[PDB]
Amino acid sequence: MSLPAHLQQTFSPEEIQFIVENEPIKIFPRITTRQKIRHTRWQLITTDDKALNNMVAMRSTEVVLWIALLLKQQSKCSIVAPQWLTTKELDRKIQYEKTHPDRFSELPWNWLVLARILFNKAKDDFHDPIHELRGKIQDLREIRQIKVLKGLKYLNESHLQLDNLSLLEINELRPFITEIMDKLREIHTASLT
Amino acid sequence: DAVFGDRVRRFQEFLDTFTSYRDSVRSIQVYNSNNAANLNILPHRIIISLDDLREFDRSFWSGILVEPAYFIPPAEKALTDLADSMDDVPHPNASAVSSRHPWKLSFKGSFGAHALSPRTLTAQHLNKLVSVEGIVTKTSLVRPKLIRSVHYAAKTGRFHYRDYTDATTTLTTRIPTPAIYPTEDTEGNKLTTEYGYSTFIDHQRITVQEMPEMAPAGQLPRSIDVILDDDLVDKTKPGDRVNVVGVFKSLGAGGMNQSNTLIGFKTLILGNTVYPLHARSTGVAARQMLTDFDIRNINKLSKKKDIFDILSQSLAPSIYGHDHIKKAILLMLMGGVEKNLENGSHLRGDINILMVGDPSTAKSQLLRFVLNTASLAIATTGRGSSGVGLTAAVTTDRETGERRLEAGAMVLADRGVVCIDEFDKMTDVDRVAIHEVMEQQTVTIAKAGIHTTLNARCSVIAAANPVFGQYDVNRDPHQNIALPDSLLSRFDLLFVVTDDINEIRDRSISEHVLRTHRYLPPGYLEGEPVRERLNLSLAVGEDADKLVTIPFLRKYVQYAKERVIPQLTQEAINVIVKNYTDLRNDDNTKKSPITARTLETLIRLATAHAKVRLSKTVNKVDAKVAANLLRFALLGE
Amino acid sequence: NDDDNTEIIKSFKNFILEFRLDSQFIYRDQLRNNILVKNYSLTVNMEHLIGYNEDIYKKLSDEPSDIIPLFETAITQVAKRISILSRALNSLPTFQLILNSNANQIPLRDLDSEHVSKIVRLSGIIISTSVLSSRATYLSIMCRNCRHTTSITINNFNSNTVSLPRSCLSNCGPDPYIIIHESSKFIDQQFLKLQEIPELVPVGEMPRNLTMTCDRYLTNKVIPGTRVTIVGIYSIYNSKGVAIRTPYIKILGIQSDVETSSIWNSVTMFTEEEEEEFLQLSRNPKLYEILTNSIAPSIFGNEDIKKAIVCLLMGGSKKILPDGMRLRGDINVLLLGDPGTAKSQLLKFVEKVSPIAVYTSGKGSSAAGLTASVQRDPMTREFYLEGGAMVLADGGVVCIDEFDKMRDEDRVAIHEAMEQQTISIAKAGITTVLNSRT
Amino acid sequence: MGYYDIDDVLADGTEFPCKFQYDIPGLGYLENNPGRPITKNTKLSLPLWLARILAIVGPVPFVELLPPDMFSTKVMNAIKTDPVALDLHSINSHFFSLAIKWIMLFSEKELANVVSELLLQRAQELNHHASSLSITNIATSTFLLKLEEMEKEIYKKSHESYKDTKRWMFKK
Amino acid sequence: MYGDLGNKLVLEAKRTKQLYARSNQDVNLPMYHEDIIRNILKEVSNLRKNTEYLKEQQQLGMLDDKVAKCQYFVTLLCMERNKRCLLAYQRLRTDILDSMAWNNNGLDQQDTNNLSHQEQEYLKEYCDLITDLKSGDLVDIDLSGSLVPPSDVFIDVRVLKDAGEIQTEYGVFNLIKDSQFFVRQSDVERLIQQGYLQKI
DNA sequence: CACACACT
DNA sequence: AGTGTGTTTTTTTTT
Ligand SMILES: Nc1ncnc2c1ncn2[C@@H]1O[C@H](COP(=O)(O)OP(=O)(O)OP(O)(O)=S)[C@@H](O)[C@H]1O
Ligand SMILES: Nc1ncnc2c1ncn2[C@@H]1O[C@H](COP(=O)(O)OP(=O)(O)O)[C@@H](O)[C@H]1O
Ligand SMILES: [Mg+2]
Ligand SMILES: [Mg+2]
Numbered sequence A: 001m002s003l004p005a006h007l008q009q010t011f012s013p014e015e016i017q018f019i020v021e022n023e024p025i026k027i028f029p030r031i032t033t034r035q036k037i038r039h040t041r042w043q044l045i046t047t048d049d050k051a052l053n054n055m056v057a058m059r060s061t062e063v064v065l066w067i068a069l070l071l072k073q074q075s076k077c078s079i080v081a082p083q084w085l086t087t088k089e090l091d092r093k094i095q096y097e098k099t100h101p102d103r104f105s106e107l108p109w110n111w112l113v114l115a116r117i118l119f120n121k122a123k124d125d126f127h128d129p130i131h132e133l134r135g136k137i138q139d140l141r142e143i144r145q146i147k148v149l150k151g152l153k154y155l156n157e158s159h160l161q162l163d164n165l166s167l168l169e170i171n172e173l174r175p176f177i178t179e180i181m182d183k184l185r186e187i188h189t190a191s192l193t
Numbered sequence B: 001d002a003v004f005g006d007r008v009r010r011f012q013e014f015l016d017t018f019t020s021y022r023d024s025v026r027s028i029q030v031y032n033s034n035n036a037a038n039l040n041i042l043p044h045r046i047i048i049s050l051d052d053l054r055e056f057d058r059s060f061w062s063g064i065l066v067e068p069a070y071f072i073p074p075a076e077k078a079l080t081d082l083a084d085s086m087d088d089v090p091h092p093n094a095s096a097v098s099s100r101h102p103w104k105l106s107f108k109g110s111f112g113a114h115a116l117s118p119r120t121l122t123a124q125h126l127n128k129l130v131s132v133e134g135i136v137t138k139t140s141l142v143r144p145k146l147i148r149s150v151h152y153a154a155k156t157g158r159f160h161y162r163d164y165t166d167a168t169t170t171l172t173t174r175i176p177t178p179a180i181y182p183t184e185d186t187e188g189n190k191l192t193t194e195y196g197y198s199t200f201i202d203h204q205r206i207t208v209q210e211m212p213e214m215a216p217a218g219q220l221p222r223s224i225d226v227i228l229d230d231d232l233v234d235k236t237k238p239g240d241r242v243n244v245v246g247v248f249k250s251l252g253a254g255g256m257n258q259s260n261t262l263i264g265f266k267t268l269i270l271g272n273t274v275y276p277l278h279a280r281s282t283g284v285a286a287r288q289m290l291t292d293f294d295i296r297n298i299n300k301l302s303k304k305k306d307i308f309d310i311l312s313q314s315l316a317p318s319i320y321g322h323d324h325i326k327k328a329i330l331l332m333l334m335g336g337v338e339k340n341l342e343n344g345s346h347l348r349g350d351i352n353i354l355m356v357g358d359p360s361t362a363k364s365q366l367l368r369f370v371l372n373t374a375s376l377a378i379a380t381t382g383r384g385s386s387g388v389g390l391t392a393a394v395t396t397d398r399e400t401g402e403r404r405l406e407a408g409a410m411v412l413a414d415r416g417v418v419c420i421d422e423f424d425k426m427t428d429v430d431r432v433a434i435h436e437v438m439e440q441q442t443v444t445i446a447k448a449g450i451h452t453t454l455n456a457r458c459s460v461i462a463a464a465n466p467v468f469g470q471y472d473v474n475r476d477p478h479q480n481i482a483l484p485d486s487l488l489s490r491f492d493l494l495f496v497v498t499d500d501i502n503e504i505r506d507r508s509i510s511e512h513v514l515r516t517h518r519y520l521p522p523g524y525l526e527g528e529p530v531r532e533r534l535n536l537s538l539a540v541g542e543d544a545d546k547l548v549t550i551p552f553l554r555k556y557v558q559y560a561k562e563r564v565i566p567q568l569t570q571e572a573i574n575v576i577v578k579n580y581t582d583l584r585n586d587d588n589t590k591k592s593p594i595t596a597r598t599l600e601t602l603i604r605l606a607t608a609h610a611k612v613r614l615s616k617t618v619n620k621v622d623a624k625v626a627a628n629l630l631r632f633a634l635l636g637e
Numbered sequence C: 001n002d003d004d005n006t007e008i009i010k011s012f013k014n015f016i017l018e019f020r021l022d023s024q025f026i027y028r029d030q031l032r033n034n035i036l037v038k039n040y041s042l043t044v045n046m047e048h049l050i051g052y053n054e055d056i057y058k059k060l061s062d063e064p065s066d067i068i069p070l071f072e073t074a075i076t077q078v079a080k081r082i083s084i085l086s087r088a089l090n091s092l093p094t095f096q097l098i099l100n101s102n103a104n105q106i107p108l109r110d111l112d113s114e115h116v117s118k119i120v121r122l123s124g125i126i127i128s129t130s131v132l133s134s135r136a137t138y139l140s141i142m143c144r145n146c147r148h149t150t151s152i153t154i155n156n157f158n159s160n161t162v163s164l165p166r167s168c169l170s171n172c173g174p175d176p177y178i179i180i181h182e183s184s185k186f187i188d189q190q191f192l193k194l195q196e197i198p199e200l201v202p203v204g205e206m207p208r209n210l211t212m213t214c215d216r217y218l219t220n221k222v223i224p225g226t227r228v229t230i231v232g233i234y235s236i237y238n239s240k241g242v243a244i245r246t247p248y249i250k251i252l253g254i255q256s257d258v259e260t261s262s263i264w265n266s267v268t269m270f271t272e273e274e275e276e277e278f279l280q281l282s283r284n285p286k287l288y289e290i291l292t293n294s295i296a297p298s299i300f301g302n303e304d305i306k307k308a309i310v311c312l313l314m315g316g317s318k319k320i321l322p323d324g325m326r327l328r329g330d331i332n333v334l335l336l337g338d339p340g341t342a343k344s345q346l347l348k349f350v351e352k353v354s355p356i357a358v359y360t361s362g363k364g365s366s367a368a369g370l371t372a373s374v375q376r377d378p379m380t381r382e383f384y385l386e387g388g389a390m391v392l393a394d395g396g397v398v399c400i401d402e403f404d405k406m407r408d409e410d411r412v413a414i415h416e417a418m419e420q421q422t423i424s425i426a427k428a429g430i431t432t433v434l435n436s437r438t
Numbered sequence D: 001m002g003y004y005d006i007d008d009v010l011a012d013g014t015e016f017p018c019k020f021q022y023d024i025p026g027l028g029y030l031e032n033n034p035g036r037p038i039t040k041n042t043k044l045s046l047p048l049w050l051a052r053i054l055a056i057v058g059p060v061p062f063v064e065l066l067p068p069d070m071f072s073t074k075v076m077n078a079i080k081t082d083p084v085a086l087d088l089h090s091i092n093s094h095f096f097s098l099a100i101k102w103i104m105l106f107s108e109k110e111l112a113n114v115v116s117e118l119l120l121q122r123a124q125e126l127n128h129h130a131s132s133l134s135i136t137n138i139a140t141s142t143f144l145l146k147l148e149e150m151e152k153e154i155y156k157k158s159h160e161s162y163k164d165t166k167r168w169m170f171k172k
Numbered sequence E: 001m002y003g004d005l006g007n008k009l010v011l012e013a014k015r016t017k018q019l020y021a022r023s024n025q026d027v028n029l030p031m032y033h034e035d036i037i038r039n040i041l042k043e044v045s046n047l048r049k050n051t052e053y054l055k056e057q058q059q060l061g062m063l064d065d066k067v068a069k070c071q072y073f074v075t076l077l078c079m080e081r082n083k084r085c086l087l088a089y090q091r092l093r094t095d096i097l098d099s100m101a102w103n104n105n106g107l108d109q110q111d112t113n114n115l116s117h118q119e120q121e122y123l124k125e126y127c128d129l130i131t132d133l134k135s136g137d138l139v140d141i142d143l144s145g146s147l148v149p150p151s152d153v154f155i156d157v158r159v160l161k162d163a164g165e166i167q168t169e170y171g172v173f174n175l176i177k178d179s180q181f182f183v184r185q186s187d188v189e190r191l192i193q194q195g196y197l198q199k200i
Numbered sequence F: 001c002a003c004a005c006a007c008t
Numbered sequence G: 001a002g003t004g005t006g007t008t009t010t011t012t013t014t015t
C-alpha cells in the first residue's frame, strides 16, 4: 500500500537510527584531507563538505554520524565518545535517578541509539571498559522503565508530560499511550453533553 | 486493641452508613422477641455483601479480604454491642443472657479475586476470606463445643466463666487449654460446674468437592473441609452443590512437630457464611420463587381447558410428537396427595409410570428432560447403579467407627420425583427389592445390625428397552419385556414406545431436528465455539436470590404442589366408579389385570388433573380425562 | 563464614547481573518478565555458570542443598535492587531457582548408595501426582508466657524438618513459641512418583519408583502417565531397618521426556503462522484426500474408510440447546469384518495419531467399571471411584480392541454412557456422574 | 469513530431490548410476522443500529430501550471489585464500544467513571503483559481471553513495538 | 435480520483482514464472496420492492404516514445499514488491492479468480496510476521505494538460484548458484524483489 | 497441647 | 523432685 499501518502509527527503530545518523558527531581523522600548498571533494548538499575537505589525521573534527560510521567501518576514521557517555557521568546520572524517583535525568534523547551503535562499532575506541558501560546503561534503562511504571499509575485523561524521556522509549511507548489517552478522551467527551 | 478498637469504630461508621442493616437487625430482634413470646428463632446471623460497604471505605473493604482474621472479629464485636444496645429488650431469657448469643457476620456476592473454586484454591491465598461453590460428599455429624465453661462454688457467689477458644472458632490462635474445672477453684472452692449458661456449638466437619465437569479430564474433584458450629448447622445434604464463604486457615502446626518432616501442612476452610445453590445450571437451589404477579398469572389460563394441553406441548419442546406421552409426563410431574389413615396403612399419592421404548426413541432424553425438570430428579440406568448401593448400604464408615446407613438413591428418592432407565438390565435383586417397597413406599432397612425403617415415597418413571430390540406385536408384551408383572402392575401408567415410521411423521421429525440443529444457541457469534462457561455469577447469597417458558412453568407447578390440594369429589367419584365398572372386567384382553391398584392410580391421576386446573377439589372432568388417557395407554393406541 | 556466605551471595548476584551474550543479559530479561507476570521464579543454565565462573559452579556441586537458598536470597535481593526504587519480610516473596543440566542421566535403576544429597539428572514417567501441600516459608510464633513474638523463615533445603523453638530465646518452656498461623506464609508442595524409564525395560525387574517434591512454580506442571526428564538433587529423609532412609528427589528443574506440551489452554504455540498454513490446507480441498491417504500407512487403499476415520477423529460438534437438551457431538464408529485385515493395526495407528484418548482392549480393561471402576482405597475402606478407560477417553477419540470377545453385559453399560456423553454412577451409595466425551 | 470501522458496524448490529411505546401496524416483519402488527408496551430485542434511532424517534419515543443486563448493576459491581478479574470478552467482544454508544446516548458520568477506571487498570496490566517478551505464558493468554477485542488489538500493537525494539537493540 | 446477512458478510471480511494483518507478509486475496453479495443484492431489490409497496401502499390505504411513513423510514434504515456494510467490505477489499499492487507490481494472489471483474480493472488502472506517479516527475525516487532505512550500500550476497548473467548498470554479474557477491545495494535489492538472491 | 506413674 | 508418655461383620469388586 502507500504506507503500512504499523509504520504510520510510530517511527520504526530503524527510522530512529536514521535520525540519529543525521546527527553530527566529534571524530578523529586518519587521513589528511587537507592538500599541501607545497582530487575529489565530498560536495554534500546535506552537510558542509568544507570540513570534509579539511580533515587532518588525528585532529579535532566534527562530522555527521552516518558518514562517521561509514569511515569507521574503514580504517580511516576514529570516533570520539560523548561526555555524558563517560563512566563518571553515567554514575552521576544513576545517582540522580535514584535520588529523584519523581523525574528523569536530562539525557540526550538519542543516547540509547548512540550507545547501541557505538557498542556495535566503536567498541575499540571506548577508553572505559565497554562491558561496565553496557551494564550501567542497562541499569539506567531499567530505572527509566520503572519510573514510567509509577507514571502509569498516574495516567490522566487531561495531560501527560515527560520531561527527560529518551526518543527511543517514547517512540516505543507512543502507540499504547496514545491509544489509552485518546480512549479516555473519547470517554470523557461522550460523558460531556 | 487500638487497631481493634479503630476497626470497631469503622464498622460502626459502616452501620451508620447503611441503615437497612440495622433495620434488618431490628426486624430480627423483634422477630426474636415475639416468637419468644409465642419458635424458629433465627440465629444472630447478619448478612452484609462484599459489594456492600465497598463504597464508603475502600480501605476497610480491602482489609476485610486481606486480613479477615483481624477485620471481622472487631466488626462482629461492634455488631453485637450495637445489637444489644439497640434490641432494647434485655430482661427476657436472662439465663441465656449470661450464656451470651454471639452476633454473626455474613456476606453476599462473589469475591472473584478471592472467590474462584476449590481446585483453584492454593496456599498462596491463605488467611483470606474466599468463597467456593461445590458438591459436598462428606458431612460430619454435629458435636457441641464448650468454649465458655460455667462453673461455680456455692460459697463464692462468683460463677466463674472460663472461656476457651482453642483452635476452630478462635482467630487469634489462643493457646490450647484443657478446661479441667479445678475442684479447688482458687480458694479451695468446690467449683460446681453449672450445666447451662455454658456455650455449646455443634461442630461439623463438612468437605466440599468441585464439579466433575468443571474438573478437567482425568482430574478427581478437589475436596476441602468446612466448619459449622451451632450457627449454620445442617441446611444441606451430602452430594449437593453449595457455595461456602470461608477463610483459608491452617492448623496442626503444619505437621512440623519435631522431624516425616516432609509431611504436608494441615489447612482447612473455616466458613462464616454459606450459600447453598444445588439447582442445576445454578438456579434457585430447587426452591422456586413466588410473586403475587406470578400467582395471578397462569391462573386465568387454568380456567381455560386448553392450559393442560399447552403445558403438555411445552414439555420436551425438542421432541416431536408424543403428545399423549407428554401429557402423561406432565401428570407425572404434578404430585398426588398421600392419603393417610389412622393405622399402618397409608395410601400413596406417588405417581409411578413404566415405559418400554425402542433405542434412540428420545425416551432416554425424555428421562433426562424429566430430570432437568424435576427438583430432586433421582435418575440412573439399569447398569448405572448398584441396587443395594442405591437402596441402602449398611457398611461402616471408618471415621464414624461403626456401621453406617448409606442409601444411594432411596433416601434421595423420597420426597422427590425419581427416574430409572433400562430397568430390564437392572440387577434382579434390586428389581425384587424395589418391588413392594415402591408399592408400600417404605423400606424397613432391617438388614444387618441396623433395623431402622425409613420411608421411601417418591414418583418413579421406568424406561426399559424390550427384550427384543423393538417391541414385536406378535410377541407378547411380557414376551417383549422379561420384567415380571410383580410391581409392574404397580405402575400408575404403562407405556409402549414403538419407533414405527411414516412419511408424514418422518418428515415432521426430520424438520424438527433441522430446526434444532441449524439454530445457533441464544446469542453468541454464528461462528463461535461452544462456551458452556461458569457464567461468572457475581450474585452470591441473597445477591444470587401459544407457548410458555419452561423454568417459569416449573415455578408455577411447584407453587401448585405448595398450594393446590384437591380432594376426591363426589361427581368425580361417580365418574371413576362408572369407568371402573367395565375397566376391571373389560372384555378386551388388554392384559395385566388392573385389580385394586389402578383404581388408586386413576384417583391420583384425576387429583393431579385437578391440580392442573388449580381447583381446591377434584372434578369429574379430571376423572374422565384420566380414564381416557389410561385406556389410551392400555390399548396401546 | 556467614560473611563469607554473604560474599558468595554477592558473587552469585555478580554472575546474574554481569552475565551477558551479545550485550544481552538474559537473566535480567527473565527477571523483568517474572516481574511483569508475578512468577517469583528464575531459570538458569549451569553451563552459563561455568562459563562465567567455574568456581561458583563447583561450590554449587559440592553441597547444593544449602547453596540453593543462598542463591534464592541473592535473586530476591537482586529483584529488590532492580524492580523497587531505592529508599522507597514477606513484602517481596522470594524467587525460586530453575535449572537445566543437559548432563548425563543415570538410570533410575542402578542408582548408587553414593550420590546422597548430590544433584543428579534423570528421566522417568509419572505414575502418580500428589495434591498440593503448603510449606512454611515464614513462621509466626509467640513465646507463650514470655509473650515474646518472633519470626522464622525456614527453607525446604535440609534433610527431617526443623524442630520447634526451645527455651525462652528472649522458664518459658521447651516450646514457648506457639505458632500463630496467620502471619505465617506458606507455599504449596506436590509429591511425584517416576517409573524407571519404560524404554530401559530391565528384563525381569519390576520398575522401581522414587518420590519427588515440587515447588509452587514447579507443582502441577505435568500429569501422571507422562514421561519427564528431571533435574533435581538426590534426596534422603527418614521414613519414620537400620540407618536406611527414604530416597527421594528435590527437583530444581522439570523437563518433559514425552516432550508433549501441557494441557492446551488455547495458547498458540503453533502461533499464527502454523495455523495459517493449517487453514491453507483447509482452503485447498485436495488436502482432505492428503489426510485420507496419509492415515494408515501401508494399508493399500480403503480410502473412504480412512475418510470416515478422519471425520470421527475430527470430532462431532456438541451443541447445547437453550432447552435442557444438548445436541450430542461425538460418535462411536463400529468395526466389523474379517480378521487379519489390519483393523486392530489401524486402531492402534489412529490412537497413536491422537493421544487425547488411550488405546485399550476389552479383556485387558476391567469388566466392572470399564467407563470408571470403583476401588477400595488402601487408607479408606470406602470403595473410591477410579477413572476407567472412558473417563480417560472422555475428551478423546478412543480405540478399543476385541469388542466381540468382550462380555456383552457391561458393553451394554457403555452405550448408555456414550449416548448421554456422561457416565452416571449411583453404585455403592455414590451418585457421582462423570462426563464421557469420547 | 471510523465510519468504515468493522467494529463500528458489528457493535451497531447487536440487538438490544426495546420496549414498544407505540402500536404501529405493518412492522411485524421486524418480529418475522409481517401480518401481525406491533402492539403497545411490548419489550423486544432490536439491533443497536436500529435501536438507538428507534429510541430517538418519537414527544414520547415510539420505541423505548431497556436497561441492559450488559449494563446491569452487578456488572458495575463486578468491575469495581476487580477490573482485572472480569473476562470482558465473555461479557462482550465489543463492550467498550457499546458503553461508548450508550454514554453518547446517555451521559452517565458514574458509568463513564467506572468504565475509565476499568480501562485504566486493564491498561496497566496490558502494559505489563506486552512488556513481557518471550526469548508463551498461560496467564498472559488467560488475560488475553479476559480482554475485549479492541484491547487485544492494543496489546498486539504494543507487544509488536516491544518485539521490534528488542530485536533492534539486541541484534543487528 | 436483513443486515444480519450483511452481518455475516462483514464478520467474514473481518476474519479475512485479521488473517492478512496478523501476517506481515502478503496474503493472497481470498475468493470473492459474491454468493453473499448476490444474496444481499436480491434482498435490497426486494427491499426496494417493499419500499415501492409502501408508496403504492399509501396511494391505496396505508395513508397513515405517522405509521406508513414511519415504516418507510425504517425500511430506509435497513437498506442504509446494508449499503454501509457493503461499502465497508468493498473498501477493505480495495485496501487489500492497493496493498498487493504496491507490494508486487510496485515492488516488481497473482490469479484473479478470487477477484471480480470490476475490481480487476480497478486494480489494473490503480497500478497504471502508480506508474503514472512514477512517470514524469518524482521519477528520481522509487514511488514504491523500500521503506526500511538503508543500512549499507555494499553488501555480499549469495545467489539463491542459478539464473545466468544479469546486466547491472556497469558491472557484469552472473547468477551462479550460491555465489557470494559484494556490490552496491540497488542491484541486490532489485534481485531480492525477484528473490533470486538471499541471505542478505 | 497434658495428666498418673517410675524413678528424677 | 526430673520429665517422660499414653487416650480419637458389611459391599462391592474383583472374578
Ligand atoms: N489391507 C491391508 N494392508 C496392509 N496390511 C494389512 C492389510 N490387511 C491386513 N494387513 C496386515 O495384517 C495384520 C493383521 O491385523 P492386526 O493388526 O493383527 O489386527 P486385525 O486386522 O484387527 O486382526 P484381528 O481381526 O484382530 S485377528 C495387520 O497388522 C497388517 O499388518
Ligand atoms: N420424536 C423425536 N423427536 C426428536 N428427537 C427424537 C425423537 N425420537 C428420538 N429422538 C432422538 O433420538 C436420540 C436418542 O434418544 P434416546 O433418549 O437415547 O432414546 P430412547 O427413547 O430409546 O431412550 C436423541 O438424539 C433424540 O433427540
Ligand atoms: Mg436409552
Ligand atoms: Mg483385533
Ligand SMILES: [Zn+2]
Residues within 6 Å of the ligand: C143, C145, C146, C147, C148, C167, C168, C169, C170, C172, C176
Ligand atoms: Zn520467653
